Ligand binder design. Structure first.
Ligand code: UDP
Ligand code: CA
Length: 456
């Protein structure tokens, strides 16, 4: 099977004078990945108001625009005129169709796969290009979509008759254009997580659930890698605490003076070792099992910093913050809420071990993301981690009651710090993540899925 992929990105790649979105830095990693595969050429196109298509290579082109790239939530997509939008999309359409003829003439062969990067406009374009490719007697080429999210929260506010999100597009991609109302336009769709798999499935239900999948699991080794010369302070010293709106800093005992909203941690270099959690504040992450376990080790007078990354509903955020400080006496355990992935790579890079004691973690990307920067991982014998965590990169605790897990986590962090798993396993954690869950393997799994699940 020989692949001639044309991929339509939604954001700008990393470059001179431009950092990348998330969906952009990915398109880029994927572009390299797919091209590195035997029997595979992928051509990408993707917009910027800074960067210019290259002169010394043809694998990609830039869609040069004067304004910043639109957004779904600086330029908003509803904020621009109707005439602004139509053009922005019909200009892009012409660039893509030129590019495609360039490619198809180049290779003496028809493109046999279209990627399109959010659920908005990029699919409509490729879907329109495809109708016309049939107008001339040349097969339409199967089109797969990446549902990262941003364009669906747009569709949800339109439906939720939210403020700045009047109803313009949702009933258009649906009633007027008919993109996800059958397999006649979009052959398949990849979500990153079952949250997104459902967010989409409710929105476009005449789209077969059999044709909405989860991307084969990888991590983005461009982002997640051993970050050179990172410090404690460089990586998270200037990260302000989170907690919750209404956090009464005044009930904190004295020893807990260190805790306070929108206030960085004092004296990062003062703590002997660092221990990291990262994940949505779901109940099954068993955040509570960590704090329980950190409560037992802060009293051991070894200076163990404990960081609690991730985002949570103001109810559940208040739950664990108050469980941590009021209920357990946690003075060396700060909540810094959610963080970008690159900031997180800096954090992992300087962390001694990470603990993600999820019950039935479906796959757990934070496990391999953290390994991809050279630090070991501790988790539980349930779910996705049973298949790739081993004694060489960390540990999985025997499953049990939350209090049971927490005692076992405590046992784990204590051994990991004491045997310096960072030094003794950090090397293999890195070479292991990069080998088995690089964008290169995820690309290979993905094209392979697409062949047998989306070629009707
Ligand atoms: O503060 C955070 C926490 C998580 N993530 C990302 O969220 C994704 C999902 O991991 P999580 O544990 O939140 O949930 P999952 O879908 O793995 O159950 C991973 O790509 C993480 O790097 C992130 O970008 N920032
Ligand atoms: Ca989307």
């Amino acid at each position: 099977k020989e692949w001639l992929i044309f991929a339509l990105g939604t954001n700008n790649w990393q470059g001179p004078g431009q950092f990348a979105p998330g969906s952009g830095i990915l398109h880029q990693g994927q572009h390299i990945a797919m091209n590195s595969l035997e029997k595979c050429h992928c051509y990408s196109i993707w917009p910027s108001d800074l960067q210019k298509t290259p002169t010394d290579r043809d694998d990609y082109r830039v869609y040069e625009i004067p304004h910043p790239i639109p957004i779904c939530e600086s330029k908003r997509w509803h904020s621009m005129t109707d005439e602004e939008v139509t053009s922005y999309c019909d200009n892009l359409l012409k660039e893509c169709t030129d590019f495609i003829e360039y490619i198809e003439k180049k290779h003496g062969k028809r493109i046999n796969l279209f990627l399109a990067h959010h659920c908005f406009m990029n699919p409509v374009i490729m879907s329109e290009i495809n109708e016309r490719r049939v107008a001339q007697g040349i097969p339409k080429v199967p089109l797969v979509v990446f549902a990262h999210g941003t364009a669906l929260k747009m569709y949800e506010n339109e439906i939720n008759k939210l403020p700045e999100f009047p109803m313009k597009y949702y009933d258009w991609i649906r009633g007027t254009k008919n993109i996800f109302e059958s397999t006649g336009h979009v052959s398949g769709v990849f979500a990153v997580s079952a949250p997104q798999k459902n967010s989409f499935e409710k929105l476009f239900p005449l789209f077969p659930q059999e044709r909405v999948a989860i991307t084969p699991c990888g991590y983005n080794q461009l982002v997640f890698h051993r970050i050179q010369g990172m410090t404690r302070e460089k990586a998270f010293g200037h990260m302000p605490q989170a907690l919750y709106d209404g956090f009464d800093a005044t009930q904190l005992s004295p020893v807990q003076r260190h805790v306070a909203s929108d206030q960085c941690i004092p004296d990062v270099n003062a703590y002997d070792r660092v221990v990291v959690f990262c994940g949505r504040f779901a109940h099954w992450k068993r955040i509570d099992s960590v704090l329980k376990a950190a409560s037992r080790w802060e009293k051991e007078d070894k200076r163990i910093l404990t960081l609690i990354f991730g985002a949570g509903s103001q109810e559940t955020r208040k739950l664990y913050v108050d469980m941590a400080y009021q209920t357990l006496g946690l003075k060396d355990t700060f909540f810094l809420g959610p963080q970008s992935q690159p900031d997180l790579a800096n954090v992992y890079t300087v962390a001694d071990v990470s603990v993600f004691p999820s019950h039935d973690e479906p796959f757990g990307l934070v496990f391999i993301e953290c390994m991809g920067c050279g630090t070991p991982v501790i988790g539980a014998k349930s779910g996705g981690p049973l298949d790739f965590v081993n004694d060489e990169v960390g540990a999985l605790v025997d499953e049990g009651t939350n209090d049971e897990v927490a005692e076992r986590v405590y046992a784990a962090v204590k051994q990991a710090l004491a045997e310096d798993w960072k030094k003794t396993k950090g090397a293999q954690c890195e070479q292991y993540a990069l080998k088995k869950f690089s964008l290169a393997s995820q690309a290979e799994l993905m094209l392979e899925f697409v062949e047998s699940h989306f070629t009707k």
